[PDB]
């Protein structure tokens, strides 16, 4: 089988002490990450959620985001269910973004960009506008990382 885990890599140029495994950084750099030369890989996931009478508030946790990344989300009801509210907060609850209703008012969308070294995000979906017992309202939630084309994804959910 294959193996998984974290690693430390030390590279040297005309520095015979590297093969000992104890080479301290010195001189001027000579190698760089190759993946930075091209475009990032998109990850998309879609889930179906239902807001019952006693379960009108729902939250979900997202994986860690590296600096420079982007985050998008949108919600579309299955049928005649009213549009719920959408917002984005961190793990402590500090607000970061709020949902915008499009001119064709059938969906709500959100967007964010990463600034800190590590960002942990939480997505809030709530339909507790009042106290009406609408019943079995069901919505479709689409989320993506580094996927600005979530409006027309086309491909099935890719990546992790």
């Amino acid at each position: 089988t294959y193996t998984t885990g974290s690693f430390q890599l030390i590279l040297g140029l005309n520095a015979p002490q590297v093969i000992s495994g104890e080479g301290e950084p010195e001189g001027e750099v000579f190698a760089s990450l190759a993946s930075l030369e091209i475009k990032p890989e998109a990850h998309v996931q879609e889930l179906e959620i239902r807001l019952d009478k006693d379960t009108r508030y729902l939250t979900q946790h997202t994986r860690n985001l590296q600096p420079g990344d982007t985050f998008h989300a949108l919600v579309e009801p299955i049928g005649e269910a009213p549009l719920p509210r959408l917002r984005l907060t961190d793990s402590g609850g500090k607000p970061l973004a709020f949902g915008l209703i499009d001119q064709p008012g059938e969906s709500v969308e959100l967007n964010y960009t990463c600034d800190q070294d590590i960002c942990e995000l939480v997505v809030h979906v709530d339909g507790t506008d009042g106290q009406k017992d609408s019943g079995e309202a069901v919505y479709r939630l689409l989320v993506g990382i580094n996927a600005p084309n979530l409006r027309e994804s086309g491909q099935t959910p890719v990546g992790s």
Binding site: Y57, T59, R87, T89, G93, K94, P95, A97, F98, D126
Partner: protein, 125 residues
Amino acid sequence: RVQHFTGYIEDGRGIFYSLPDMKQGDIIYASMQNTGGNLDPLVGIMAEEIDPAVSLGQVLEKALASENDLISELTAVADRIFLGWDDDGGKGYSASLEFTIPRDGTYHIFAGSTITNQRLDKFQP
């Protein structure tokens, strides 16, 4: 030129500090860190001393009743009340501010609490 201050904030009641007779061309620096409790620092600078409580209260009045998007309404009110401000520019929720003194005169520094949510079961600023 560095000076230290320590204080306590109760239910969003800020503290004013006076900067007498600054000169044009000076650069002000500010940093505010939490040392106890759940305080979320906020710092702002202005010329004429006016209590922001009446203006900031309307932001809590609107959010408490609707969607209103706090992060929008707070930025718009702050850009009117203060000449310069910062919420989370430091390590964590701490604030840090750089402000070039526009003209010659005196100014005021305002320290206090921002409007935030700290729950995941329901939204309550």
